Nucleic acid binder design. Structure first.
Ligand SMILES: [Zn+2]
Ligand SMILES: [Zn+2]
Ligand SMILES: [Zn+2]
Ligand SMILES: [Zn+2]
Ligand SMILES: [Zn+2]
Length: 143
DNA sequence: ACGCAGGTCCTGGACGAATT
DNA sequence: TAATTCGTCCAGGACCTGCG
């Protein structure tokens, strides 16, 4: 089971050169599954079929409680926790709990105090990019 | 006023599982 | 078994919203 072919990008081992070339597509994108609409590339054909719904607006995962539909089954699973009051994600620092995992991750950054987004007009610094974008509307409306 | 931050759901890379 | 395809988790983000 010796493997002598290595990828110079991630270091993974392969027994045949043909296996290394097939893997190397993950770094170059060459010959990866390509969407016929936008020509962006994905790691396998299943991820491509998933992305295909972004062009059709199909939402095949419907909540049986409220009737709303979602593009991904994981999104429906996260949404169902709202109905059930299930908040398994908690900030270890202050104890605030969330049903949404990204809401928890986003909140925990506030304990660091980092504000890496600075308004190019007035210099006001924000912890989040979406709040900086909304702040810049104030300058556009001022003009 | 508007800065703050939580609510919500879309997007796709990661990676083991299932299928071919 | 190896290659391919699938299911799923997860990270990141956009848009929305009311509070102080
Ligand atoms: Zn590699
Ligand atoms: Zn596309
Ligand atoms: Zn619902
Ligand atoms: Zn906290
Ligand atoms: Zn500004």
């Amino acid at each position: 089971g010796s493997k002598s072919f290595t990828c110079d990008q991630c270091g993974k081992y392969f027994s045949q050169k043909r296996q290394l070339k097939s893997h190397y597509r993950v770094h170059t994108g060459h010959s990866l599954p390509e969407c016929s609409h936008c020509h962006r590339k994905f790691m396998d054909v299943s991820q491509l079929k998933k992305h295909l719904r972004t062009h059709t607006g199909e939402k095949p995962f419907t909540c049986e409680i409220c009737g709303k539909s979602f593009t991904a089954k994981s999104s429906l699973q996260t949404h169902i926790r709202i109905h059930r009051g299930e908040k398994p994600y908690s900030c270890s620092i202050c104890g605030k709990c969330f049903s949404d995992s990204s809401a928890k991750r986003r909140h925990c950054i506030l304990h660091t105090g980092k504000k890496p987004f600075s308004c190019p007009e007035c210099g006001l610094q924000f912890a989040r990019l979406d709040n900086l974008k909304a702040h810049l509307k104030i300058h556009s409306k001022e003009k």
